[PDB]
Write a protein that binds this ligand. Sequence first.
Ligand SMILES: *[C@@H]1O[C@H](CO[C@@H]2O[C@@H](C)[C@@H](O)[C@@H](O)[C@@H]2O)[C@@H](O[C@@H]2O[C@H](CO)[C@@H](O[C@@H]3O[C@H](CO[C@H]4O[C@H](CO)[C@@H](O)[C@H](O)[C@@H]4O)[C@@H](O)[C@H](O)[C@@H]3O)[C@H](O)[C@H]2NC(C)=O)[C@H](O)[C@H]1NC(C)=O
Ligand SMILES: CC(=O)N[C@@H]1[C@@H](O)[C@@H](O)[C@@H](CO)O[C@@H]1O
Ligand SMILES: CC(=O)N[C@@H]1[C@@H](O)[C@@H](O)[C@@H](CO)O[C@@H]1O
Ligand SMILES: [Ca+2]
Ligand SMILES: [Ca+2]
Ligand SMILES: [Ca+2]
Lengths: 217, 218, 214
Amino acid sequence: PCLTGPRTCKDLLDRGHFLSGWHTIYLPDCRPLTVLCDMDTDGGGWTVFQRRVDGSVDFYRDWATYKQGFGSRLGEFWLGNDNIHALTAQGTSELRTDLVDFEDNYQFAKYRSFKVADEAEKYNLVLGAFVEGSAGDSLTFHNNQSFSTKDQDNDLNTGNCAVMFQGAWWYKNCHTSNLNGRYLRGTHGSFANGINWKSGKGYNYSYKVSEMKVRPA
Amino acid sequence: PQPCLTGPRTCKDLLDRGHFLSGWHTIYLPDCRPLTVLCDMDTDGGGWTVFQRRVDGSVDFYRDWATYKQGFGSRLGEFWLGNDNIHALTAQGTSELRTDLVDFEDNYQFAKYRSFKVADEAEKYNLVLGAFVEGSAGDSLTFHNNQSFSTKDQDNDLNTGNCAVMFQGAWWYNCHTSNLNGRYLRGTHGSFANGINWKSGKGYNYSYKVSEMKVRPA
Amino acid sequence: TGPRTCKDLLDRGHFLSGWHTIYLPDCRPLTVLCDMDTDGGGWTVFQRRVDGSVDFYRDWATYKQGFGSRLGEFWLGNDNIHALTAQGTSELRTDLVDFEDNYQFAKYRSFKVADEAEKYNLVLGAFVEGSAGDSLTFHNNQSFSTKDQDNDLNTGNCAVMFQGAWWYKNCHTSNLNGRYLRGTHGSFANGINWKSGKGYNYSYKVSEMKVRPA
Ligand SMILES: *[C@@H]1O[C@H](CO[C@@H]2O[C@@H](C)[C@@H](O)[C@@H](O)[C@@H]2O)[C@@H](O[C@@H]2O[C@H](CO)[C@@H](O[C@@H]3O[C@H](CO[C@H]4O[C@H](CO)[C@@H](O)[C@H](O)[C@@H]4O)[C@@H](O)[C@H](O)[C@@H]3O)[C@H](O)[C@H]2NC(C)=O)[C@H](O)[C@H]1NC(C)=O
Ligand SMILES: CC(=O)N[C@@H]1[C@@H](O)[C@@H](O)[C@@H](CO)O[C@@H]1O
Ligand SMILES: CC(=O)N[C@@H]1[C@@H](O)[C@@H](O)[C@@H](CO)O[C@@H]1O
Ligand SMILES: [Ca+2]
Ligand SMILES: [Ca+2]
Ligand SMILES: [Ca+2]
């Protein structure tokens, strides 16, 4: 069934699967991977590689853990950097970020392309242009930057951005978005260690919900 | 079409076969065609297929005709199974309708019904209800029977204007007795009869927290 | 030619916790909840409390077949738990989460339950460690009781008195299938309680029981 089956969430939408949920697709190397398809938002057909919903899961994790993915299909998760690379290595995927505060305000941001290099290249980010979005652009800042974890500092800071802002990211010096930060529940006094999108609700507010998803453009 | 003799026909068959846990399973409509449904194995004995569910306001139920046509939402949250599917699922033979409704105070309420069917789209997804049977809810969905289902981008109601808009939902609409796909307006709300409203559950000013609409061959 | 435990699944590259299907000693397929995230991962979860939305005060027929929702709380079923732990020694972990979001846990060298004929009798290994303390050893070598089938060592009915289902003795020091009484409660020992953890008056927010081949 490598040849019979679907390759992206967009294919699945095309075959009449209209409910968001966990489906299995086939990577370019025929590796089956079970992913979360968002069939409801902005046309549908999105593959979701990051989800924060309740802070039930700990996102302050080491390199090996971000490499392979972690969390629960039942809630919060990170698909894993190898998988994310695999899903974007060949061709041309757009990127949607979806955010929701505790007041119930939906914000979003969209990007013309999104790709991450392989581990040899430290999961480098190549971000396309900012298209539109109510959350403002807080990711172009992090273009062309390696991913870093607490136990592997690849940022452009003389210190450790992952430790300073309690997360994992394509930190530069340090950040303008921090979606793998701590689930601090709305306003917080600690400086920028939450689920923060600057242009969105700033350095001191942590969203209720965060989702990053890709669709083939 | 006619009852698939070759695999699990309904959530009921699943139960009889030893899937005791509530969850997304897959069945074969009389088409003998597959679809992946939510089976409620736990309630009023078990065996139910759920075509509608609200829980947490996460999803926007104020959608147009084409989107109710095919179903929307998420397997992990609120969802509508789509009217084509719902047709195909009930309008083969006899199948009961149960409704579960929970208030934000954390109680429980219901409303078994004899028989439930939606005619197709060709025929405006007209609802064929049957006799109320029992349930702490009252709303004996007598009205709405023989009524075309209505959205925002179409009309068809007992009221000149959009029943849809004026109340912000979708249902088989002079104007509405029970407004289940309405706006997840957490609790008692000043605005009138636009919330997630049973009628004799909590009137028009209490939108519930949790809602489910399911079916089992009667 | 396929997995027989959550541990196997971990070994093949399934890194996300979730519902997978495994194959039991007889090859009956069984869909279980794999915890791939906690303490090394590879745990099969047979009991889960999360929010109190499921009735746990249930009979023998229901505790035998299992009940609830993969979407939330559930009990895998006594038949299943025995099949899962029929032979090659699985260790048990017990994971507990209070209402201020604090974690306590407990871990046991081994865990096994007999079949229905021996009335799902508890066979438990040695306490190896855990912030929750030991509150299960006390129940070693006791049959399981529900409300409609009293097998305890009490002249009365422990299942009824503490609104639960357990290897009740006279009666319990843990009562994890107890009523979901959110937080501290005046009522005595009828919550999701763990005597050594938070005592007979604190009922937890999350509770999970899980097995992995030792
Ligand atoms: C992405 O960013 C890199 C540098 O950032 C690193 O690499 C990326 C992939 C991430 O993993 C980050 O975390 C890392 O921080 C840019 O590299 C620079 O590109 C510019 C072009 O604008 C180069 O500027 C030129 O360099 C010429 C000579 O380069 C050679 O010598 C230098 C040092 O002497 C050496 O570092 C380099 O490798 C070559 O050997 C020079 O003649 C020319 O006139 C101009 O100065 C700059 O040298 C590059 N630096 C590095 C570190 O290589 C990428 O350009 C950028 N890519 C994209 C797509 O934008
Ligand atoms: C959190 C993180 O990335 N650290 C993990 C920890 O969670 C646990 O999985 C451990 C097992 O020894 O391996 C790491 O140390
Ligand atoms: C709730 C419980 O455990 N009790 C059940 C009850 O709900 C019902 O299903 C009955 C048979 O009709 O079996 C028990 O007696
Ligand atoms: Ca650094
Ligand atoms: Ca009209
Ligand atoms: Ca007794």
